[PDB]
Amino acid sequence: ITSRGQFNPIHNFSYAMERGVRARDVKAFEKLITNPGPLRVAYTPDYLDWLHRCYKAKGTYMDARAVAEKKFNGAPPPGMFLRPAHSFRRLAGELKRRRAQSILDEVARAQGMLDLFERQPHFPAIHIDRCSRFHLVELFKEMVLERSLDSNMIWEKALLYRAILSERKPSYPTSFHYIFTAVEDTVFAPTIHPLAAKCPTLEAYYYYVYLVKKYYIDNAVEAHVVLRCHREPNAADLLFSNPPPKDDTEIMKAVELLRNADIQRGPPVLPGAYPPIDMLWRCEENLPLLKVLLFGEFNLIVSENPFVKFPSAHGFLTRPYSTDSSMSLANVMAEKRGHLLPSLPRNTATSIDARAQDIRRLQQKHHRDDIVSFQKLLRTPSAFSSYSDWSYFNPRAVRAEERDRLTRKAVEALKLYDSATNDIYRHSFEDVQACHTQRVTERDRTMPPYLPTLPHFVAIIKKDPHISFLLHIGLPDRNSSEEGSAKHKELEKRIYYLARALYHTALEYHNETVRRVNRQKVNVAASLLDNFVEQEWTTILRDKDTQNDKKQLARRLGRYMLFANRSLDDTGFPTDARADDYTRWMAPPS
Amino acid sequence: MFLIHFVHYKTILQKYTFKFKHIFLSIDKYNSLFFNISGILIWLNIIHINIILIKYSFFILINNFEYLIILIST
TM segments (chain A) (predicted)? Predict the structure, then answer.
């Protein structure tokens, strides 16, 4: 379970605290939080604080629980009593709780890990100083490689990160210094050759330097935007930046200056092809570049909205605004209406064009205000929440579905944890003595055997002689032919729809507003089913006697009673009530 | 012995309505036509006339039970 801007634990404190290892001072706690193994997770002060408080609270908790159980050698809900230990019900209950809580723990940590490699702000920097080829290659193949559709973009990503690191070098914090070792250590293929197939060209690198200098790229984020837009035919337009881009004279001059200044130590076209991807990960020669790449992804990611800096690229990277327009309406409506209908009378044509204009105006008017109001409404669980709605753009943002799977697993675990309450704890004896005074009676005091349940309705609408006939016999066989499987799928699907409709009507039957609407869903569904049945039936009879064959059997069934004109109430059975009454109950909304 | 603790469902649904009028709804009363009395004549020992409104009288009642009384345009 997670919502936007929530903290999740990536640490397992529980294991050590069950062994009895506890921390007192803050120094001890910092010592508890630091991975020996290669990776280094930095933290914001805030997250670190939160985590600390949680740690202390868990100390107090395990402490008081243990002390309670040493005194008795949990604490019940208000009106309840503890069943004895070594009672089946209590053993089962406690078991249930153990399992549920392990699940919830794992889920918490898994969502924490998603946060960690999604680069959520409270995990500001992942440091790789201690890794060896194994760790680096693996990190690469799990994080960078697998995700990417395009191979060639990975190289670009690498060089551009190298350029950003090399150009922004002063402003980086001290903990970053190690990575620059890898930057000066990068190996390039000689200018036009054993490394030509292994490593990229220097020319390329200077193209990307040109890009960092011309568009002022400070981030992996703007990096992302630039790298997606730069090879496209509209490039100048997409990447046109709010502080306007520097003029290529100065830039190419500064690139000449860097190129030359770096020679004495030992409009540029978009670069060519690069060596096949595998080289990067499997040649020792590229190992420093690889390193940069990882460092580029796990750090170098900052909150900022790239679409303040590149306001024209917002439409391309993520979807455009619907309130933003990149014939007359009447002519469109004419095209849909076909040639078989009269053309719109030219009154209505003119009138509709008028609306089309007024709507254009409404769009233009509300475009800004809707955006503003929307973000302000998000900043204020609450109606507005999500896994990710953040104001800022995150190119590594996790897929909604990975998070939702976890959440669902955690909610199962919660319901499981809640079950066990009635196993471990019990009501007062004489309360159940009292309770057994009013017996359960079949007729009145027991819920009726027909409740709303989807198979109850599916059964009811499959119990009709015509539809039972259509399913089994009537349609050409589902396995034998293609028409068979097609017709079968559609008949089944339509039954299913009408069933869902009746079901949702039955559940909400008591409240009028919802019932009239759900009722309209029943009408639409039933109409669909009726047209299918009617058609297929006619087909059966027309299609081209012998005793007891298909057609005779069909004509014996009689007239097909339409599911539309059926009057079924809440229990899925025809009503007791007078037709005038039933009709009024189910009438459309206004 | 007791194996269980449960919550007592009941179906209280009134769905039918039978209301039967009590007898006294149909009992008789005495109802009367009512017009504005324009005049009255009483006679038992001595005759007495009261005239409320003088108009041509379109209707006249005579009633003999204790005293002779004549209700004019009654």
Answer: none
Let me know if A189 is exposed, middle or buried by CB neighbors in 10 A (0-12, 13-18, 19+): buried
Q: How many CB atoms lie within 10 A of CB A525?
A: 22
3-state helix, strand, coil in chain A (%, to 5): 60, 0, 40
Residue with tokens 């799990």: A142
Contact A107, A406 (CB under 8 A): yes
Rounded to whole angstroms, the Cα distance separating A80 from A74 reads 12
Cα separation of A120 and A42, whole Å?
A: 12
Q: In the block, which residue shows the tokens 């009057």?
A: A567
Q: What is the resolution of this structure in A?
A: 3.1
Q: At what angle do helices A579-586 and A512-542 cross, to 10 degrees?
A: 110
Residue B10: its chain A contacts at CB < 8 A? Answer: 444-445
With both helix axes pointing from N to C terminus, report the angle between A550-557 and A512-542 in degrees, rounded to the nearest 10.
Answer: 140
Contact list in A for residue B11 (CB cut-off 8 A) is 444, 448
SS (H, E, C) B10-38: CCCCCCCCCCCCCHHHCCCCCCCCCCCCC
* CA–CA gap between residue A371 and residue A349 (Å, rounded): 33
**B1/A contact by beta carbon, under 8 A:** no
